[PDB]
Amino acid sequence: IVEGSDAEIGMSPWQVMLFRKSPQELLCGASLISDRWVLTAAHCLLYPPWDKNFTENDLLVRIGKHSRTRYERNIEKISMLEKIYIHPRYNWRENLDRDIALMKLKKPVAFSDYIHPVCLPDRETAASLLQAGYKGRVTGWGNLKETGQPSVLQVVNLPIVERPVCKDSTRIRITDNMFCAGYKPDEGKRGDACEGDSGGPFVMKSPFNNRWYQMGIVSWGEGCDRDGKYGFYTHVFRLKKWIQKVIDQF
C-alpha cells in the first residue's frame, strides 16, 4: 500500500497472508470468509507469463497477523491448504478477467480478537454501495511505493471511480467483473495498492447493518499510485455465483 497508514490492532481481522514455504516469504494477501474458506486473486496462484503455478503443498495461510515479518506467537494462526479452486473462466491470457480463487483449509481456524471472517455482499448491499465516490478500504503488506516493505499491515481508504474514467485511464479492456478505485489528480489525496497487496480485500462498511463487506479483490494496476491511473479490483458480487457453487459442492 502506497500512501496508506499503519493498521490498528484488529482493524482487519479477516486479512490473510499467503505465505511461500521455501523460500519462506509473502506471496500475496487474501481474506477469511468463514472458518475454513479463504478468498484470493487467481493471479496469486496461477500466472503462466511469469511461470507461476502454485499447488496446495507450496503454501501456507497466516491469519490474525499484524507484523509483516515477525512470527506472532499466541496471536497468528498458520493453516495448511486442503484444496485450491480457480475460476474456470479466469482470463490470464488477456486482462485478468474473473481474477478470483478459493482456498479450502485443512482444518477450521479458531476465531479470536484478531481472527474473524468478513461478509460477502448480497445483491442489495452491492447495488447500494458500489457507486462512484463511495469509499472502501484496502489492506495489505505489499510495497510502500512503486520503485520498501512495511513493518506492519497497511491501510488506505479509496473512492470507487466511475466506469468511463476507469476505461479511459488504460488501454486494457475492462470488464463488468472489475471495478477501479483511487483519487483523481484533481482530487489532491492519493494512495493505491501495489505489488504484494494482490489478492487482499477491498472492503466497505454497510451503513444499513454496520457490517463490513468485501466488495473487491486487489487484482491489477499499471504502476502504483500513478497520477491518472487507478487500481483495479475483482468484482466479488459479480462472481458470487461461482463462490457459492464451490462452497456448496465442497
Binding site: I9, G10, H116, P117, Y134, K135, N157, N210
Partner: peptide, 27 residues
Amino acid sequence: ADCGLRPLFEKKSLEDKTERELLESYI
C-alpha cells in the same frame, strides 16, 4: 452469522480512526 463484526471494534462499540471517512462518502 457473525461476519463483518470485528471483536475489537463493532462488538465493543468502538470505532476505528478512519471508518467515518467511509460513512461520510455514502451520500
